[PDB]
Amino acid sequence: QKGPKYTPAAEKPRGRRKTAIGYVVSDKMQKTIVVELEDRKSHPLYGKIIRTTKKVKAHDENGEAGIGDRVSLMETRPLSATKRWRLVEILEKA
Amino acid sequence: AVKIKLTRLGKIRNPQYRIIVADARTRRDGRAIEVIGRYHPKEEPSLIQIDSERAQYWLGVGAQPTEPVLALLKITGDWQKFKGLPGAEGTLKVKE
Amino acid sequence: PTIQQLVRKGRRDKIAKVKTAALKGSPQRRGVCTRVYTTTPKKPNSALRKVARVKLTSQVEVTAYIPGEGHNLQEHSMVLVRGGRVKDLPGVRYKIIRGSLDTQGVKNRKQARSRYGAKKEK
Amino acid sequence: ANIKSQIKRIRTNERRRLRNQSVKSSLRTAIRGFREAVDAGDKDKASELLHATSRKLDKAASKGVIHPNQAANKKSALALALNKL
RNA sequence: UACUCGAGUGGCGAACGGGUGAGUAACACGUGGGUGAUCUGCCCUGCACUUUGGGAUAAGCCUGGGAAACUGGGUCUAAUACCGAAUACACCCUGCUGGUCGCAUGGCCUGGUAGGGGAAAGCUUUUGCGGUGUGGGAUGGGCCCGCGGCCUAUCAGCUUGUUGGUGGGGUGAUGGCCUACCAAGGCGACGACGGGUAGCCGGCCUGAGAGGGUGACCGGCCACACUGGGACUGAGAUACGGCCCAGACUCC
Ligand SMILES: [Mg+2]
Ligand SMILES: [Mg+2]
Ligand SMILES: [Mg+2]
Ligand SMILES: [Mg+2]
Ligand SMILES: [Mg+2]
Ligand SMILES: [Mg+2]
Ligand SMILES: [Mg+2]
Ligand SMILES: [Mg+2]
Ligand SMILES: [Mg+2]
Ligand SMILES: [Mg+2]
Ligand SMILES: [Mg+2]
Ligand SMILES: [Mg+2]
Ligand SMILES: [Mg+2]
Ligand SMILES: [Mg+2]
Ligand SMILES: [Mg+2]
Ligand SMILES: [Mg+2]
Ligand SMILES: [Mg+2]
Ligand SMILES: [Mg+2]
Ligand SMILES: [Mg+2]
Ligand SMILES: [Mg+2]
Ligand SMILES: [Mg+2]
Ligand SMILES: [Mg+2]
Ligand SMILES: [Mg+2]
Ligand SMILES: [Mg+2]
Ligand SMILES: [Mg+2]
Ligand SMILES: [Mg+2]
Ligand SMILES: [Mg+2]
Ligand SMILES: [Mg+2]
Ligand SMILES: [Mg+2]
Ligand SMILES: [Mg+2]
Ligand SMILES: [Mg+2]
Ligand SMILES: [Mg+2]
Ligand SMILES: [Mg+2]
Ligand SMILES: [Mg+2]
Ligand SMILES: [Mg+2]
Ligand SMILES: [Mg+2]
Ligand SMILES: [Mg+2]
Ligand SMILES: [Mg+2]
Ligand SMILES: [Mg+2]
Ligand SMILES: [Mg+2]
Ligand SMILES: [Mg+2]
Ligand SMILES: [Mg+2]
Ligand SMILES: [Mg+2]
Ligand SMILES: [Mg+2]
Ligand SMILES: [Mg+2]
Ligand SMILES: [Mg+2]
Ligand SMILES: [Mg+2]
Ligand SMILES: [Mg+2]
Structure with missing residues (x-):
């Protein structure tokens, strides 16, 4: 009962990696x-919807994005302190 | 090798032992991935119920039960079913 | 208060006016008497009550009220103190249980015996 | 140390530190020599040193002193530097 | 005599399970993904092989220091303790050539191609167990993610590896994890940084309810081990009864 060096480990495909959209x-x-x-939520106590915005920063190697433009996001690898979000494609520019 | 444990809860003078399939690395009461029943001797019948299908899937996936668990599985006939020697033997004394 | 003001400021609940500062949240403190004297209640009620100044394990100087009728307390007597307001005495906010440590319940008590720490008849 | 088991473990751990420090120092000297060859700027001697150092790196990693994927990592990084120069 | 055995290696086990909450406002915590970026002994299950030579040390005996713990010097002995070599060509790396997917480098069809490289150990003759690599899986793990989760502006500007790029070094794995040079920015009034408070949560008390309080036990996580640090061992260290150094405490 021999056998080659072929007792591997388990498999795992790639699933959902966070995607979002925002303004530069x-x-x-x-x-x-x-x-x-920009996201909307209701206070846990008040019941009044809430529209607050958080701060994020994306990646571009060529800087085709101008001030005040809409972009989409995909979580890339951690590349710098406080920065891991990477731009996928531009949706508009101004 | 995740082994079939008997999770314990409750108080002192009446211990409880739920049948849990988990790794022996964690605490004796630690992470329970999947529960298939419980075992308690305080009651005289000390009735025990086993889910044959789940027990068999865990055995075939790589969980080796501890000796008392295996003995109780033979009692319930799950060991008999897995071995295929005598078949499936039902002799459990369901509580009066 | 509009909803935006509520979000802006948050609603603040009352800050509790904590009473009985001495025990600092304890149901009991043990202390030693420093003096025994008397004081005169406010104008509506006039009398001659007995109050004791005691040193606490929590290092706080607060008077305590002496229950019952007779007492065996002389300066430097370890005592037990509980929480309770007193209106006749303005600077008094504590009692002194009887029947514990060196403070025994006043003799000749048979009614409400438990409150003052007295044994039965025989 | 108050148990025979733990004291014996400390003995064994000191022995195996002597051994592992020896092996790891050898590996580090190999990598240092490779680095010196590269910043000197040779090709064939660099390749031969790559051969020897890789052989001893693989021996050590199989022995278990260091770890396989990182061994491949610095070996391939060194190969990349060589091919660059 | 081996029934048996002191200690002696060698292993394996000791990272288990038990305890505590001082600090910690943090991806510290519950829940929701993950990885085409990691590993994982002991379990089962299909599937190559396990040739070969060598040396040393404990134990022991003698000697010596020393109350002591502890120590050395010398002789000697063996190995599942040790290392070389044999191969491998299915695995790890590098220079040349197609199809599929797109969520991108690029992944998968072990895609094809040229080079070179690499592992083991035996025990029992009986429900027989061992060693090395990796198409299958699991578990334990690490990283980071949206959201969130005290009070104080009678705390308003803070921050320099700090913030990003490139290149190197580093990690089981990308990344200021570390280094050099470039640009001056990043965080900030949808409350930064400051101060006091305090382990988080499933839960416990209350309330018709929303909500308020709160974290007893059990349990899921976190962090701690006389106070401050660091590192070795390995699949697995914050290493409680593992190691070293510094202070305190007690003692010889
Ligand atoms: Mg296989
Ligand atoms: Mg496998
Ligand atoms: Mg997983
Ligand atoms: Mg435990
Ligand atoms: Mg019975
Ligand atoms: Mg047994
Ligand atoms: Mg002792
Ligand atoms: Mg060295
Ligand atoms: Mg050196
Ligand atoms: Mg190793
Ligand atoms: Mg690298
Ligand atoms: Mg590289
Ligand atoms: Mg013996
Ligand atoms: Mg072990
Ligand atoms: Mg250990
Ligand atoms: Mg441990
Ligand atoms: Mg406990
Ligand atoms: Mg306690
Ligand atoms: Mg704490
Ligand atoms: Mg904070
Ligand atoms: Mg997760
Ligand atoms: Mg292990
Ligand atoms: Mg051989
Ligand atoms: Mg000898
Ligand atoms: Mg011989
Ligand atoms: Mg060989
Ligand atoms: Mg060969
Ligand atoms: Mg070849
Ligand atoms: Mg082929
Ligand atoms: Mg061997
Ligand atoms: Mg997530
Ligand atoms: Mg959340
Ligand atoms: Mg770089
Ligand atoms: Mg890179
Ligand atoms: Mg980095
Ligand atoms: Mg640099
Ligand atoms: Mg804490
Ligand atoms: Mg709740
Ligand atoms: Mg209500
Ligand atoms: Mg309410
Ligand atoms: Mg709470
Ligand atoms: Mg528990
Ligand atoms: Mg708990
Ligand atoms: Mg977890
Ligand atoms: Mg500590
Ligand atoms: Mg530690
Ligand atoms: Mg301990
Ligand atoms: Mg101890």
Whole structure:
């Protein structure tokens, strides 16, 4: 009862990696951009919907994004402190 | 090798042992991935019920039961079913 | 208050006016008497009550009220203190249980015996 | 240390530190020599040093001193540097 | 005599399980993904092989220091303790050529191609167990993710590896994890940074309810081990009864 070096391990495909969309605000970076997301939620106690925005920054190696533009997001690898979000494709520019 | 444990809860003078399939690395009461029943001797029948299908799937996937668990499985006939020697033997004394 | 003001400021609940500062949240503190003297209640009620100044394990100087009728307390007597307001005495906010440590319940008590710490008849 | 088991473990661990420090120092000297060859700027001697160092790196990794994927990592990084120069 | 055995290696086990909550406002915590970016002994299950030579040490005996713990010097002995070589060509790396998917480098068809490289150990003759690599899976794990989750502006500007790029070094794995140079920015009034408070949560008390309080036990996680640090061992260290150093405490 022999057998080659072929007792492998388990498999795992690739699933859902976070996707989102937002507006670019600061272009004074070099091949990096910060984006803000608009989301709506209701207070757990008040019952009044809430519209607050968080701060995020994406990746671009060429900087085709201008101030005040809408973009989509995909979570890439951690590349710098506080920055891991990477732009997928531009939706509009102004 | 995840082994078939008997999770314990409750108080002192009446211990409880739920049948849990889990890794022996964690605490004796630690993470329970899948529960298939419980075991308690305080009651005289100490009735025990086993889900044959889940027990068999765990055995075929790589979980080796502890000796008392295997003995109780033979009692319930699940060991007999898995071995295929005598077949499936039902002799459990359902509580009066 | 409009909804935006509510979100902006948050609603603040009352801050509790904590009473009985001495026990600092405890149901009991043990102390030693420093003095025994008397004081005169406010104008509506006039009398001659007995109050004791005690040192606490929590290092706080607060008077305590002496229950019952007779007492065996002389300066430097370890005592037990509980929580309770007193209106006749303005600077008094504590009692002194009887029948514990060196403070025994006043003799000749048979009604409400438990409150003052007295044994039965025989 | 108050149990025979633990004291014996400390003895064994000191022995195996002597051994592992020896092996790891050898590996580090190999990598240092490879680095020196590369910043000197040779090709054939660089390749031969790559051969020897890779052989001893693989021996050590199989022995278990260091770990396989990272061994491949620095070996391939060194190969990349060589091919670059 | 081996029934048996002190200690002696060698292993394996000791990272288990038990305890505590001082700090910690943090991806610290519950829930929801994950990885085409990691590993994982002991379990089962299909599937190649396990040739070969060598040396040393404990134990022991003698000697010596020393109350002591502890120590050395010398002789000697064996190995599932040790290392070389044999191969491997299915695995790890590199220079040349198609199809599928798109959520991108690129992944999968072990896609094809040229080079070179690599592992083991035996025990019992009986419900017989061992060693090495990896198409299948699981578990334990790491990373980071949206959201969230005290009070104080009588705390308003903070931050320099700090913030990003490139290149190297580093990690089981991308990344200021570390280094050098480039640009000056990043975080900030949809409350930064500051201060006091305090392990988080499933839950416990209350309330018709929303909500308020709160974290007893059990349990899911976290962090801690006389106070401060660091590192070895390995599949697995915050290493409680594992190691080293510094202070305190007690003692010889
Ligand atoms: Mg296989
Ligand atoms: Mg396998
Ligand atoms: Mg997983
Ligand atoms: Mg435990
Ligand atoms: Mg019975
Ligand atoms: Mg047994
Ligand atoms: Mg002792
Ligand atoms: Mg060295
Ligand atoms: Mg060196
Ligand atoms: Mg190793
Ligand atoms: Mg690398
Ligand atoms: Mg590279
Ligand atoms: Mg013996
Ligand atoms: Mg072990
Ligand atoms: Mg250990
Ligand atoms: Mg441990
Ligand atoms: Mg406990
Ligand atoms: Mg306690
Ligand atoms: Mg704590
Ligand atoms: Mg914080
Ligand atoms: Mg997860
Ligand atoms: Mg292991
Ligand atoms: Mg051989
Ligand atoms: Mg000898
Ligand atoms: Mg011989
Ligand atoms: Mg060989
Ligand atoms: Mg060969
Ligand atoms: Mg070849
Ligand atoms: Mg083929
Ligand atoms: Mg062997
Ligand atoms: Mg997530
Ligand atoms: Mg959340
Ligand atoms: Mg770089
Ligand atoms: Mg890279
Ligand atoms: Mg980095
Ligand atoms: Mg650099
Ligand atoms: Mg804490
Ligand atoms: Mg709840
Ligand atoms: Mg209500
Ligand atoms: Mg309510
Ligand atoms: Mg709570
Ligand atoms: Mg538990
Ligand atoms: Mg708990
Ligand atoms: Mg977890
Ligand atoms: Mg500590
Ligand atoms: Mg530790
Ligand atoms: Mg301990
Ligand atoms: Mg101890």
